[PDB]
Amino acid sequence: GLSDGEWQQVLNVWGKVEADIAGHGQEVLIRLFTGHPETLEKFDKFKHLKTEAEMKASEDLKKHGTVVLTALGGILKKKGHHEAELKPLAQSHATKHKIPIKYLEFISDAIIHVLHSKHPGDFGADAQGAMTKALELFRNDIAAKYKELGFQ
Ligand code: HEM
């Protein structure tokens, strides 16, 4: 549950991502895959990438980065009212992709890392606080649907 001030910060930060959605999406996925290689195993179409150079060179990875962040952005722009948007994602990731909630924690922190890396000194403490809360909310609502599905 975020305040309007905090949502304002979130969508302010998001404007950064939107100026270059493919570049951000790419770096988030790379940070995830290199920070936590077990996550790469959940992607049949990226599991071939063994080096970060190959990851960097992958137009299809950038493409998927775009899909992921486009979806996240759509969800964030709802300012918490994202049940319709989130439900199919929770369902596909629990039932088809089989993604444990731990990996959503991983990518949340990865987003935080990328924003500092791409915008050093331009991602203030208040901004980080708001973004972190927003990703926690997202994660928590997925976690609820996972529990419903009995998915571990
Ligand atoms: C911010 C968090 C995430 C968002 C917004 C997101 C969104 C999406 C979307 C929109 C799709 C395509 C439609 C669908 O299959 O439902 C997708 C596919 C997929 N996601 Fe996620 N995702 C997130 C996190 C993750 C994480 C952390 C993993 C694994 C570590 C993951 C694994 C996958 C896989 C394996 C696919 C199918 C890829 C393919 O073969 O096309 N996702 N995701």
Distances (CA, A) of 82 to 2, 4, 87, 100: 13, 16, 8, 20
The CA 151 to ligand 1 mean position distance, Å, reads 16
Chain Cα centroid distance, residue 31: 11
Minimum-distance ligand 1 atom for the alpha carbon of 106: 27
Resolution given for this structure, in angstroms: 1.8
Experimental technique: X-ray
- Exposed, middle or buried: residue 88 (CB in 10 Å: 0-12, 13-18, 19+)? exposed
As a whole number of angstroms, the distance between CA 145 and CA 142 comes to 5
- 3-state helix, strand and coil shares in percent for the chain, rounded to the nearest 5: 75, 0, 25
φ, ψ at 68 (rounded to 5°):
-65, -50
93 is in an annotated binding site: yes
Q: Which two tokens stand for residue 103?
A: 């990996």
Residue with tokens 């203030």: 124
Assign domain 1-152 one CATH number from 1.10.490.10, 3.40.50.300, 3.40.605.10, 1.20.1090.10: 1.10.490.10
